[PDB]
């Protein structure tokens, strides 16, 4: 039963067990080779366990099937973590749909590129518009941008 497998994936993900979620997702992918949600979860599992190149290889092996349901955030995130900042920037700017996750990464990418004026505008917006457990951290990031300008 593939609904039963998905129930397993969800349970593991909610408990942060991406190692076991990956095993179950791979069983789903044996049944439905082009399930976009399964490929998306596989990418997340790999990123969560530090396997950024493996996650990127999944994305780039399934480009057509993932097109426009796509994981531009995850692809750019892996590129960012793999010291490919220029790739990461292009992936973000090429995304079909802009999201809060993409904007968060975009601020970090602009910081790494030393584009501090644009970075500051992004972080001011991120600080204002975000409601999450990371306001203190995000304001620390904003202060690092202000410091770099001076």
């Amino acid at each position: 039963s593939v609904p039963a497998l998905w129930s397993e994936v969800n349970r593991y993900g909610q408990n942060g067990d991406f190692t076991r979620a990956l095993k179950t997702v791979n069983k789903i992918l044996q049944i439905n080779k082009d399930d976009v949600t399964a490929l998306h979860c596989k990418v997340v599992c790999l990123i969560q366990n530090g396997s950024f190149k493996e996650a990127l290889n999944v994305i780039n092996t399934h480009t057509k099937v993932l097109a426009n349901n796509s994981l531009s955030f995850e692809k750019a995130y892996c590129e960012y973590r793999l010291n490919r900042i220029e790739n990461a920037l292009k992936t973000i700017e090429s995304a079909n749909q802009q999201t809060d996750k993409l904007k968060e990464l975009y601020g970090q990418v602009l910081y790494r590129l030393e584009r501090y004026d644009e970075c500051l505008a992004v972080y001011r917006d991120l600080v204002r518009n975000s409601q999450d457990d990371y306001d203190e951290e995000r304001k620390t990031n904003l202060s690092a941008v202000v410091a770099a300008q001076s």
């Binding site: 994936v9 949600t37 998306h40 979860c41 990464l105 990371y134 202060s143």
Partner: peptide, 21 residues
């Protein structure tokens, strides 16, 4: 290097899975 947090990592999460049930 000032302290700078990778907050993007906190966004790395499964999509909603209800429909897969």
């Amino acid at each position: 290097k000032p302290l700078f947090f990778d907050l993007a990592l906190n966004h790395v999460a499964f999509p909603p899975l209800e429909d897969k049930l």
